RNA sequence: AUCUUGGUGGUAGUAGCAAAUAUUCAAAUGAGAACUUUGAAGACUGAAGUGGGGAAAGGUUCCACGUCAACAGCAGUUGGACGUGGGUUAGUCGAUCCUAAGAGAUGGGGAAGCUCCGUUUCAAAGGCCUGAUUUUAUGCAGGCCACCAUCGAAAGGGAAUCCGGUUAAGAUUCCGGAACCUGGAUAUGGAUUCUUCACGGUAACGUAACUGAAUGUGGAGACGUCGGCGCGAGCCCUGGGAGGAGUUAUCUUUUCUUCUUAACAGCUUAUCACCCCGGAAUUGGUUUAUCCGGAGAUGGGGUCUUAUGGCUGGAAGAGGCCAGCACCUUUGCUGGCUCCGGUGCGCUUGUGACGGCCCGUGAAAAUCCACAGGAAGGAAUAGUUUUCAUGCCAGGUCGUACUGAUAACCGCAGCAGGUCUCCAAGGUGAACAGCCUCUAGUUGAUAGAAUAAUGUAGAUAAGGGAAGUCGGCAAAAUAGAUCCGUAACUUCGGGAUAAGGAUUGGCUCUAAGGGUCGAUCAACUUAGAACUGGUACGGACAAGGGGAAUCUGACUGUCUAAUU
């Protein structure tokens, strides 16, 4: 029952937090997810000819 | 002491056999003056020092 | 949930006393002693792992047939392919240049 | 009094050298026919760190002249020697960095290292990182080269004594500050039990000539005779002078 | 220990000199569909190794049980 | 963003040890961790591995060198001296 | 292959 | 004679038997029960345990039967006690073998001498191979190499085993099944040969095999530490289904629980690495981490290690869970089901490819293999080959019970001390914190009655606020997280959580952030809004007081075990 209510977003406000933001969820773990999303999408587009290798290379460095 | 030398185990076997009270019939012997076993040992009282 | 014991008298976490937990046909977890992992044979020239050779602890190499321990070439299970290629090139070229060295010396005479 | 720290060292118990991780003694090849009369070629197979030592070592492999086998030597690497390089050792070897020549066979001004004191001693002088000997003269009648050592001492040696051309590698080691006690700790862990060091004035009289007193102080001259006996030689032994050296130390 | 596929190979094993016992186990299994069928495993004991032939078709099974030698001491189940 | 005005690699030492010692360590720390140009294969892949030992990642050739840089000034002047004397004896 | 194994083969052929 | 040994008083039925939360009811047993046993209840350890195993150490304490004089600072019918017996099963687990720091004979040299040095030396320092000869298992035939005893690890190195069952007490040791290693013996198949010692593949390399002495060269054995990332395993969590149990005034398609698969073997499975084709600037590929490429990138196509996973054999016949008949039966007997999934910055652990660090670069030897070499031997109607398969025989010796500590060890003892290590569930939470719980274990520790003073341990306090005191000693106050805001000084790194403020619950919502082929599947993080309450809300637990200066030691580090 408690786990369900947490799924819906309860019990999670400032007065229920005791670890830091990073201790709760490391900012590195958030970056690695993000950059792995962007790298995946770029590879997909390039491989389907939605983008060329020249736009790919520039976007990869901007990601 | 689970993994023990034979020499240690042989000494322990000797100690097992000696750990007994005096046989009662000794007391009946003619001119007997042995009352009890005066060299009895116990693991809680005195250590063997190997 | 269920906790396990070492199966031997060594109680310490040494390199030779590693366990994995395994579930048995009796439905219970149990430690299983693991042997140390084998390293791949390495080339005598460059140091790289040799392709085609089995990876085993040393004495296990005695139990297995010769095809597991070699490859079909000069220096088979000893030097890698690119190391053998350099040996052949170098042997051929230096032995030729030796013929030229002598002739150039024999002309100047 | 009790036996002082500097006297305990000779018994060599806890004060022996920590040699577990060393590669073997660095030494030239044994001086044999080939080296006396011609040269022999070896290959540099490896260049490798030796625990305790600044300079890296070079594992040089030579063929045996009399038996079908190889013979690994352990040289102290000169600056510039590389894996795969051939090294030439003997009377007739050419004047290139890494080669082993008799000192008779090199011009004045040659830089050498790992020089033998006596011929066939297998190496003695200029072996620490960044050091070398300079040849400064020949006496072909007496068969004696003259050389300048790292200390700045001049010295006359047999012209048959061998050296390696060039300077020992790993130079400039002692320019980086150690910074931390811990770095000195790890340095001396691979050498011997010489560190850290308690000052004699921080001890009691029983333990050191300097010990004791209601202030820490030496109390007699710190300069000690050369003829003093064990237990007295603490401080500055046989000092010609003392105090800050105002100038250059070179001859 | 060892599964043997070829029936020609299996029959060689039954006639081998060290082979004194065999076993015939019947499993009730289910295929890709929920239709059930009687798998049979023939197992011959050997010396170093037990060898099993798995026969799913109960026709071929019935033939195979007949063609075992009468020297071989066969345990049904 | 530029993260330190000056300490650079020596920012790992915090405020300890003295500016003058940190500054001397910094010069040699930069040299010892630099990539150097390989004399053999031409690539910029020579890195220190223990004082005096400089190895190329690409071609795998190791060279004996200085404690904190591949070539000390003393060893350069020696190479040049030895070349000079070698040419004097060879005519 | 080890000497003990080589020696075994040599005995086997000597019969 | 603070005499010696022995005995005995007063003190005195006195000090006392108060740490570790905790006991209660009934029955049984028995002369006797606060304390034994069973049952019922109430609690605790709370997986960095009061649980399950071991190392050192002990030595029978293990288990049973009998049993209470002494011992268990109360008791005792109970016991680690007393008496009498029973009990430890190995080719595969250890020892045994190897070498480490080291220890230590010999040759020699010292020393009046007990002995000392030294460990390969200033020594005539051995012991293998092969054929035979068929005289015999030694001289003979040949060859071959010569380093320097030995001891030193129950955590280092190291040939080989697993599952289920079984006892009062033993089990990786017994039984049943199923494997494997070493040494020996050895003949059948397969393979090989008239091109004598195999073929295929451009290649990386493949294969059931596929001659190879001396000698030599390589490899494995064989190695730090930290960091993030990937992958595996076990655990955790969770869906559907098939069973059993619990709750049911009401509600709950509910809560709990069973649904497993060993070593070994076959086939298959990879990051890395490598090969072929090809020839790159409009530089491309690419990691969380920026490295790679004309010394050949990307790309296309292949090869390899088998860590690891999958499928099959092992193996359902075992184990587990149920049901239905037997019945103070040996204790049965019969039948059924034992299935299919999901998820992840999870935990623990293994491992891969990497990166950081060093004036630190992180054992040795036995042992095993490969290669180079070409000694030697070998066919035609018959020769070779046991590194391929199958088959035969053997595997000695010593250890093995149990505790491993608030009662099995050391501390005069059944002592709140000390003493090395493995496994490790749910919730809350950053968390192996504290608090609560499941599995397992315990419920021990003299008790009853009463509730004075003085204590010990724990608390609270009007108004004042350090006036107390050598001295704020002791206590209080502060405390988590989010946002804001942070001075002097400074070695420019710091100071800094400076100082100083605000917020925090519950409920109902909203938004953003993904995977796989427009469909479909799935985590938790963050931000916002409404409503709501005795304005509470890090609600217990957990958890900095701060500032202005001075003396002094630069810093981390270290010492007077038991007054610094
Ligand atoms: K192979
Ligand atoms: K020291
Ligand atoms: K000092
Ligand atoms: K003094
Ligand atoms: K044994
Ligand atoms: K051992
Ligand atoms: K080791
Ligand atoms: K590393
Ligand atoms: K004692
Ligand atoms: K005051
Ligand atoms: K300090
Ligand atoms: Mg975290
Ligand atoms: Mg970051
Ligand atoms: Mg005694
Ligand atoms: Mg293979
Ligand atoms: Mg000093
Ligand atoms: Mg003092
Ligand atoms: Mg004195
Ligand atoms: Mg003083
Ligand atoms: Mg004096
Ligand atoms: Mg009293
Ligand atoms: Mg008391
Ligand atoms: Mg009680
Ligand atoms: Mg508690
Ligand atoms: Mg509790
Ligand atoms: Mg008992
Ligand atoms: Mg009593
Ligand atoms: Mg009593
Ligand atoms: Mg007894
Ligand atoms: Mg073993
Ligand atoms: Mg001696
Ligand atoms: Mg030994
Ligand atoms: Mg071991
Ligand atoms: Mg037992
Ligand atoms: Mg058995
Ligand atoms: Mg751990
Ligand atoms: Mg046991
Ligand atoms: Mg036990
Ligand atoms: Mg325990
Ligand atoms: Mg005791
Ligand atoms: Mg105690
Ligand atoms: Mg949580
Ligand atoms: Mg109590
Ligand atoms: Mg008050
Ligand atoms: Mg008040
Ligand atoms: Mg006030
Ligand atoms: Mg006052
Ligand atoms: Mg006053
Ligand atoms: Mg205080
Ligand atoms: Mg301040
Ligand atoms: Mg603040
Ligand atoms: Mg200080
Ligand atoms: Mg003290
Ligand atoms: Zn190679
Ligand atoms: Zn290079």
UniProtKB/Swiss-Prot annotation, chain A:
Subcellular location: Cytoplasm
Segments of this protein annotated with the region Disordered: 1-21
Signal peptide: none
Residues the record lists as Phosphoserine modifications: 27
Record function comment: Component of the ribosome, a large ribonucleoprotein complex responsible for the synthesis of proteins in the cell. The small ribosomal subunit (SSU) binds messenger RNAs (mRNAs) and translates the encoded message by selecting cognate aminoacyl-transfer RNA (tRNA) molecules. The large subunit (LSU) contains the ribosomal catalytic site termed the peptidyl transferase center (PTC), which catalyzes the formation of peptide bonds, thereby polymerizing the amino acids delivered by tRNAs into a polypeptide chain.
Subunit-level organization: Component of the large ribosomal subunit (LSU). Mature yeast ribosomes consist of a small (40S) and a large (60S) subunit. The 40S small subunit contains 1 molecule of ribosomal RNA (18S rRNA) and 33 different proteins (encoded by 57 genes). The large 60S subunit contains 3 rRNA molecules (25S, 5.8S and 5S rRNA) and 46 different proteins (encoded by 81 genes). eL19 lies in close proximity to the binding site for eukaryotic initiation factor eIF4G.
Other noteworthy facts: Present with 97700 molecules/cell in log phase SD medium. There are 2 genes for eL19 in yeast.
Recorded family membership: Belongs to the eukaryotic ribosomal protein eL19 family.
The name this protein goes by in its record: Large ribosomal subunit protein eL19A
From Swiss-Prot, chain B:
Pfam families xrefs: Ribosomal_L39 (PF00832)
SUPFAM superfamilies cross-referenced by the UniProt entry: Ribosomal protein L39e
GO annotations of cellular component type: cytoplasm; cytosol; cytosolic large ribosomal subunit
Assembly description: Component of the large ribosomal subunit (LSU). Mature yeast ribosomes consist of a small (40S) and a large (60S) subunit. The 40S small subunit contains 1 molecule of ribosomal RNA (18S rRNA) and 33 different proteins (encoded by 57 genes). The large 60S subunit contains 3 rRNA molecules (25S, 5.8S and 5S rRNA) and 46 different proteins (encoded by 81 genes). eL39 interacts with YIH1.
Cross-referenced PANTHER family: LARGE RIBOSOMAL SUBUNIT PROTEIN EL39 (PTHR19970:SF0), RIBOSOMAL PROTEIN L39E (PTHR19970)
Matches recorded under HAMAP family: Ribosomal_eL39
Job description of the protein: Component of the ribosome, a large ribonucleoprotein complex responsible for the synthesis of proteins in the cell. The small ribosomal subunit (SSU) binds messenger RNAs (mRNAs) and translates the encoded message by selecting cognate aminoacyl-transfer RNA (tRNA) molecules. The large subunit (LSU) contains the ribosomal catalytic site termed the peptidyl transferase center (PTC), which catalyzes the formation of peptide bonds, thereby polymerizing the amino acids delivered by tRNAs into a polypeptide chain.
Protein name per its UniProtKB record: Large ribosomal subunit protein eL39
Source organism of the structure: Saccharomyces cerevisiae (strain ATCC 204508 / S288c)
Record gene name: RPL39
Curated annotation (Swiss-Prot), chain C:
First-listed, main subcellular location of the protein, grouped into a coarse class: cytoplasm
Keyword Ribonucleoprotein: yes
The entry's keywords: Cytoplasm, Ribonucleoprotein, Ribosomal protein
Biological processes per GO annotation: cytoplasmic translation; ribosome biogenesis
Entry-linked Gene3D superfamilies: 6.20.340.10, 6.20.370.70
Domain of life per record: Eukaryota
Statement: the UniProt record of this protein carries the keyword Ribonucleoprotein: yes
Signal peptide positions on this chain: none
Subunit structure: Component of the large ribosomal subunit (LSU). Mature yeast ribosomes consist of a small (40S) and a large (60S) subunit. The 40S small subunit contains 1 molecule of ribosomal RNA (18S rRNA) and 33 different proteins (encoded by 57 genes). The large 60S subunit contains 3 rRNA molecules (25S, 5.8S and 5S rRNA) and 46 different proteins (encoded by 81 genes).
Note: Present with 23600 molecules/cell in log phase SD medium.
Family: Belongs to the eukaryotic ribosomal protein eL34 family.
Protein name (record): Large ribosomal subunit protein eL34A
From Swiss-Prot, chain F:
One annotated Gene Ontology cellular component of this protein: cytosolic large ribosomal subunit
GO MF annotation list: structural constituent of ribosome; zinc ion binding
Localization: Cytoplasm
Residues making up the signal peptide according to the UniProt record: none
Keywords from the UniProt entry: Cytoplasm, Metal-binding, Phosphoprotein, Ribonucleoprotein, Ribosomal protein, Zinc, Zinc-finger
Location (main, coarse): cytoplasm
InterPro entries according to UniProt: Ribosomal_eL37/eL43, Ribosomal_eL43, Ribosomal_protein_eL43, Ribosomal_zn-bd
Phosphoserine: modified positions: 39
Zn finger residue spans: C4-type: 38-59
A Pfam family it matches: Ribosomal_L37ae
GO biological process terms, semicolon-separated: cytoplasmic translation
Subunit organization: Component of the large ribosomal subunit (LSU). Mature yeast ribosomes consist of a small (40S) and a large (60S) subunit. The 40S small subunit contains 1 molecule of ribosomal RNA (18S rRNA) and 33 different proteins (encoded by 57 genes). The large 60S subunit contains 3 rRNA molecules (25S, 5.8S and 5S rRNA) and 46 different proteins (encoded by 81 genes).
More details: Present with 44600 molecules/cell in log phase SD medium. There are 2 genes for eL43 in yeast.
Family under the similarity heading: Belongs to the eukaryotic ribosomal protein eL43 family.
Name the record gives this protein: Large ribosomal subunit protein eL43A
Chain's gene name: RPL43A
